[PDB]
Amino acid sequence: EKLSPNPPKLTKQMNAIIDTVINYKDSSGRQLSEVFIQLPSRKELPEYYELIRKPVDFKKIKERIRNHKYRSLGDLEKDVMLLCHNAQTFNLEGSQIYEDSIVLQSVFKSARQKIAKEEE
Amino acid sequence: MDVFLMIRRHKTTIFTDAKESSTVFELKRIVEGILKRPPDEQRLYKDDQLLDDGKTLGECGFTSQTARPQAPATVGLAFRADDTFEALCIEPFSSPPELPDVMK
Amino acid sequence: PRPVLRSVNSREPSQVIFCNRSPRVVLPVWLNFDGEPQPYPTLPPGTGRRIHSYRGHLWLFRDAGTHDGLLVNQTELFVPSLNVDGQPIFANITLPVYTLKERCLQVVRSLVKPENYRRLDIVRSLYEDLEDHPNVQKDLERLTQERIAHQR
Amino acid sequence: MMYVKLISSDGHEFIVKREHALTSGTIKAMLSGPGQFAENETNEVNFREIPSHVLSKVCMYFTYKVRYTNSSTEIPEFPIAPEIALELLMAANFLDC
Numbered sequence: 001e002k003l004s005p006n007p008p009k010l011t012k013q014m015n016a017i018i019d020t021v022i023n024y025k026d027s028s029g030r031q032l033s034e035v036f037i038q039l040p041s042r043k044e045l046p047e048y049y050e051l052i053r054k055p056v057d058f059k060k061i062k063e064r065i066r067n068h069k070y071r072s073l074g075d076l077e078k079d080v081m082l083l084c085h086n087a088q089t090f091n092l093e094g095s096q097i098y099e100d101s102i103v104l105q106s107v108f109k110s111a112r113q114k115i116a117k118e119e120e
Numbered sequence: 121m122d123v124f125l126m127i128r129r130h131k132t133t134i135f136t137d138a139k140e141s142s143t144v145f146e147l148k149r150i151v152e153g154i155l156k157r158p159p160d161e162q163r164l165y166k167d168d169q170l171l172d173d174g175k176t177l178g179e180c181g182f183t184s185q186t187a188r189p190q191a192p193a194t195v196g197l198a199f200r201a202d203d204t205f206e207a208l209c210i211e212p213f214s215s216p217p218e219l220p221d222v223m224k
Numbered sequence: 225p226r227p228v229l230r231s232v233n234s235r236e237p238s239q240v241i242f243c244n245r246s247p248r249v250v251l252p253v254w255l256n257f258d259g260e261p262q263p264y265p266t267l268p269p270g271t272g273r274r275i276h277s278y279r280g281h282l283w284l285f286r287d288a289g290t291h292d293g294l295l296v297n298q299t300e301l302f303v304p305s306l307n308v309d310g311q312p313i314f315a316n317i318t319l320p321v322y323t324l325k326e327r328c329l330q331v332v333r334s335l336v337k338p339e340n341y342r343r344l345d346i347v348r349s350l351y352e353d354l355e356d357h358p359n360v361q362k363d364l365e366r367l368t369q370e371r372i373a374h375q376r
Numbered sequence: 377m378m379y380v381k382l383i384s385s386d387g388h389e390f391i392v393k394r395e396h397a398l399t400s401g402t403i404k405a406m407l408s409g410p411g412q413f414a415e416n417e418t419n420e421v422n423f424r425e426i427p428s429h430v431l432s433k434v435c436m437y438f439t440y441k442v443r444y445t446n447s448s449t450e451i452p453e454f455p456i457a458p459e460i461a462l463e464l465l466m467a468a469n470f471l472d473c
């Protein structure tokens with residue numbers, strides 16, 4: 001009987017955290033998540049799929065919140081960190097994508113911590 | 121810095137360059153080597169303003185911004201032949217036709 | 225990874241400064257791993273940007289509006305040199321000295337719609353010249369054939 | 377320097393450095409050719425189909441080309457007014473410059 005949806009509170013927390021990450025703008029007003037919403041296709045960037053074993057984007061993450069694939073905030077965190085580490089591994093230190101994904105990890109941890117400080 | 125000029129008299133145009141710091145007299149020495157008239161037989165002008173020998177081209181108003189390779193400044197030229205002083209006369213160039221309809 | 229003119233998938237970061245010292249809006253063009261041209265964000269006249277690229281990555285620069293060829297460090301192609309002790313590599317984009325013929329064709333093309341070229345009162349051979357618009361593909365071919373012939 | 381004289385259809389005479397005129401392939405070919413008496417080069421060219429407003433503009437191009445070719449000084453645009461564009465295009469085509 002595991003068709004069971006997550007409690008509305010858990011879905012509300014997951015979506016609040018992911019919205020903060022997605023809506024985040026730097027001091028110059030640039031939305032750091034733009035490039036990370038949708039992965040390049042296998043035909044657009046095959047080198048990405050040759051290197052990255054578990055590709056993920058914010059579209060597949062939002063999809064995984066809706067279809068209750070994450071059963072805890074820790075499951076959500078694991079995938080956001082996977083997205084960011086994939087971006088870092090492919091693009092390497094020095095690239096803007098690498099730098100943007102570092103900030104997004106930090107924005108995720110602050111949002112996750114805000115939810116923690118609101119329950120207890 | 122370099123200044124780019126057109127020295128004009130009647131239907132003759134000399135294309136030359138000189139430094140902004142160089143004098144009107146040194147420009148007359150350049151015209152001398154080309155047209156074989158010494159500086160004392162030459163009068164140089166900026167529009168209708170006679171140019172003084174001791175002045176630099178920059179002091180006359182010829183700068184890198186107003187006297188460019190692609191858009192040189194005009195220096196008017198009149199010759200003095202002993203007691204004779206010709207009037208400054210520069211013949212205008214021809215005119216392009218009216219701009220075609222397909223270019224408006 | 226097939227043509228002579230292409231980027232190498234080096235995976236070696238290289239910081240570059242793109243500086244537009246031309247009166248044109250500049251289109252930076254990256255040649256991918258298959259030698260296919262990729263448009264990058266444009267640079268307004270007088271603007272510079274510190275960008276991230278990689279060793280062995282090939283660039284060319286064009287007028288964004290007309291695709292007229294531009295120079296980078298006095299040449300047609302840019303591949304960053306060795307990034308020594310963190311120092312960025314400078315890419316100075318400027319106008320070439322176009323021939324008077326090419327410059328005239330540029331001005332006429334900017335004033336006349338292509339459907340009106342043949343209404344102009346000029347020698348017939350000049351209609352094909354106006355129609356032979358600048359294109360990065362023909363330039364890649366010329367630059368490829370230059371390198372291939374040079375390999376003797 | 378050595379100078380040459382270029383004469384427009386309407387009789388205007390343009391005196392330019394020989395090196396600057398050599399920018400034109402057509403002029404280069406005309407000057408290289410034998411001259412009068414014992415001279416092996418030419419120093420005067422007559423253009424029966426190029427008027428003075430166009431020829432003056434061509435000479436400005438020669439100055440621009442020699443000044444900016446292989447330079448590290450930032451290169452400005454060579455400006456061409458819409459009204460002279462077609463005649464200038466025809467002159468550049470004929471002159472091979």
Ligand SMILES: Cc1ncsc1-c1ccc(CNC(=O)[C@@H]2C[C@@H](O)CN2C(=O)[C@@H](NC(=O)C2(F)CC2)C(C)(C)C)c(OCCOCCOCCN2CCN(c3cc(-c4ccccc4O)nnc3N)CC2)c1
Pocket residue numbers: 035036037038039040045047056057058083086087088090091092095096097233235236242252254263264265266267273275276277278281
């Ligand atoms: C501001 C400005 N003004 C004037 S020019 C200019 C400017 C200049 C540079 C950049 C960014 N830099 C680059 O794209 C450099 C240049 C060249 O060397 C190639 N390259 C690369 O990174 C390549 N990388 C590699 O070779 C490696 F990474 C393997 C080593 C690719 C193969 C193209 C990715 C810029 O960037 C802003 C504009 O974007 C340019 C257009 O690119 C669009 C296509 N691209 C976007 C990024 N994308 C990626 C998505 C994800 C991703 C997406 C979703 C989820 C997780 C993710 O990891 N991860 N990595 C990507 N590279 C792939 C498709 C703007």
